[PDB]
Enzyme design. Structure first.
Site, PDB file in Angstrom:
ATOM      1  N   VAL A  31       5.715  -7.234   7.307  1.00  0.00           N
ATOM      2  CA  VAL A  31       6.264  -8.408   6.576  1.00  0.00           C
ATOM      3  C   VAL A  31       6.405  -8.006   5.102  1.00  0.00           C
ATOM      4  CG1 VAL A  31       5.558 -10.761   5.809  1.00  0.00           C
ATOM      5  CG2 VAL A  31       5.573 -10.177   8.236  1.00  0.00           C
ATOM      6  N   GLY A  34       3.329  -4.904  -1.008  1.00  0.00           N
ATOM      7  CA  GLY A  34       3.087  -5.168  -2.442  1.00  0.00           C
ATOM      8  C   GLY A  34       2.563  -3.922  -3.138  1.00  0.00           C
ATOM      9  N   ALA A  35       2.152  -4.050  -4.404  1.00  0.00           N
ATOM     10  CA  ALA A  35       1.665  -2.932  -5.249  1.00  0.00           C
ATOM     11  C   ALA A  35       0.242  -2.532  -4.829  1.00  0.00           C
ATOM     12  CB  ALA A  35       1.723  -3.322  -6.709  1.00  0.00           C
ATOM     13  N   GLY A  37      -1.293  -3.491  -1.702  1.00  0.00           N
ATOM     14  CA  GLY A  37      -1.511  -3.603  -0.254  1.00  0.00           C
ATOM     15  C   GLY A  37      -0.228  -3.774   0.534  1.00  0.00           C
ATOM     16  N   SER A  38      -0.372  -3.653   1.853  1.00  0.00           N
ATOM     17  CA  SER A  38       0.700  -3.761   2.873  1.00  0.00           C
ATOM     18  C   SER A  38       0.333  -4.906   3.816  1.00  0.00           C
ATOM     19  CB  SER A  38       0.845  -2.454   3.597  1.00  0.00           C
ATOM     20  OG  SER A  38       2.050  -2.437   4.330  1.00  0.00           O
ATOM     21  N   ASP A 169      -1.801 -16.713  -2.445  1.00  0.00           N
ATOM     22  CA  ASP A 169      -1.538 -15.597  -3.387  1.00  0.00           C
ATOM     23  C   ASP A 169      -2.044 -15.910  -4.794  1.00  0.00           C
ATOM     24  OD1 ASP A 169      -0.308 -14.065  -1.447  1.00  0.00           O
ATOM     25  OD2 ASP A 169       1.730 -14.570  -2.101  1.00  0.00           O
TER      26      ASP A 169
END
Lengths: 343, 16
Positions: A31, A34-35, A37-38, A169
């Site tokens: 989905v 990010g910087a 994490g995945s 988030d």
């Protein structure tokens, strides 16, 4: 001692890296990355729900990353509220501290954000009351623990088909359209009422169908804001720490606060009244989440006996000066001490 | 007790 039985794990390579997760989690699907994490969507065979599974990227490579990992885990483990992201699970394939290198966080899947909802239908005044009510109900909870989200915006609000909302988030660092002016230009310290500014920006847009302050850089953004709420008064200028920022503000043609009723004709006047109370330039004078819940706009939804506060949240760890492996060990302890939610 | 309080409970559409 009384540690959870270790599930059976299986390994798969999804895109760039090896994912090793309990067999509980099935049909993993990327989905996006990010910087820090995945993230994959997965089917949680234990709860029967689709969930987000975040694999942190090398969380213990540095002090900044190790502490950031610890910060996130402490925050998600604390937050237990219907309108806030909770930690469903956290796991590592590691059987010891020595082999602990990877952290996976399992949280509410973003089925739709507030933008997806606006995209596919026209919200009623009732939808807007209920959406803003739930944001403020979540904020009352987090603000009561002296947690500040710092980055409220439609893309961080999950909404299901029952119009139920969760705040996702959180900002974990120590588009600007929804940011309070005092933090956008670093005028002074974050207070929790930066979040209230963001709710005001979101509500205006849900009422009108138009972004309130869609500026292209910090200056254009600040001028759009000051055109609506007026230039800072002498009392606010005293509270701005930077002389340069103070000098810059004094350089601006003084502007009056506008009459909001003329910017929002045909909106519920109680909604406009609440907007007035949220979008005050002086952060000290904005309505708080708790006050906002008592506003007549939410008369239909407000229940003082079902708007709970949080346990106090100890953030003294923020001033600790520790080694990578000390942040790592603290993180590992929090993985170990994790109690899943009931049911 | 929030769903009982709502004016309408027709499901929203999530993707379109």
């Amino acid at each position: 001692h009384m540690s959870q039985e270790r599930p059976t794990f299986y390994r798969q390579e999804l895109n760039k890296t090896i994912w090793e997760v309990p067999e509980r989690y099935q049909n993993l699907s990327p989905v996006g990355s990010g910087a820090y994490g995945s993230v994959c969507a997965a089917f949680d065979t234990k709860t029967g729900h689709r969930v987000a599974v975040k694999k942190l990227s090398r969380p213990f490579q540095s002090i900044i990353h190790a502490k950031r990992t610890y910060r996130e885990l402490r925050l998600l483990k604390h937050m237990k509220h219907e309108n806030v992201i909770g930690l469903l699970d956290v796991f590592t394939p590691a059987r010891s501290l020595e082999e602990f290198n990877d952290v996976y966080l399992v949280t509410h899947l973003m089925g739709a954000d507030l933008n997806n909802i606006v995209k596919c239908q026209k919200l009623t005044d009732d939808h807007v009351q209920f959406l803003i009510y739930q944001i403020l109900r979540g904020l009352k909870y987090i603000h009561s623990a002296d947690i500040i989200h710092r980055d409220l915006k439609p893309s961080n609000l999950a909404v299901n088909e029952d119009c139920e909302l969760k705040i996702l988030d959180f900002g974990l660092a120590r588009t600007r359209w929804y940011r309070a002016p005092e933090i956008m230009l670093n005028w002074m310290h974050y207070n929790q009422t930066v979040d209230i500014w963001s709710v005001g920006c979101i509500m205006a847009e849900l009422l009108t169908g138009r972004t309130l302050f869609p500026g292209t850089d910090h200056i254009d953004q600040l001028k759009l804001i000051l055109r609506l709420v007026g230039t800072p008064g002498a009392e606010l200028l005293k509270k701005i720490s930077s002389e340069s920022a103070r000098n810059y503000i004094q350089s601006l043609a003084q502007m009056p606060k506008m009459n909001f009723a003329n910017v929002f004709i045909g909106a519920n006047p109680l909604a406009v009244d609440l907007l007035e109370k949220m979008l005050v330039l002086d952060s000290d004078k904005r309505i708080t989440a708790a006050q906002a819940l008592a506003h007549a706009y939410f008369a239909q939804y407000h229940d003082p006996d079902d708007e709970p506060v949080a346990d106090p949240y100890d953030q003294s760890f923020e001033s600790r000066d520790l080694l990578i492996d000390e942040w790592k060990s603290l993180t590992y302890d929090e993985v170990i001490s994790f109690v899943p939610p009931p049911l | 007790r929030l769903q009982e309080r709502r004016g309408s409970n027709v499901a929203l559409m999530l993707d379109c």
